[PDB]
Amino acid sequence: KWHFGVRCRGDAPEILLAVYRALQRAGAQFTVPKPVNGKYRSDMYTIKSRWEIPHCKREGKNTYAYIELQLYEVMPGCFMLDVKSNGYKDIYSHDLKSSFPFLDLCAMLVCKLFSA
Give me the residues that bind another protein (CB under 8 A), please. 1-6, 12-14, 16-17, 20-21, 24, 29-33, 40-42, 44-45, 48, 50, 53-56, 58-59, 61, 63, 70-74, 79-80, 82-85, 87-90, 96-104, 106-107, 110-111, 114
CA-based nearest residue to 64, from 47, 89, 96: 89
Contacts of 41 (CB under 8 A, 6+ apart): 33, 34, 35
Report the distance separating Cα 84 and Cα 97, nearest Å: 12
The distance of closest approach from Cβ of residue 9 to another protein in the complex, given in angstroms and rounded to an integer, is: 14
CA 88/CA 81 separation, integer angstroms: 21
Residue 22 CB, shortest distance to another protein, in Å, is: 11
For another protein, give the closer residue by CB, 37 or 59.
59
Least separation in angstroms between residue 37's CB and another protein is: 13
Q: How far is the CB of 70 from another protein (least distance, A)?
A: 8
Beta bridge partners of 50: 29, 66
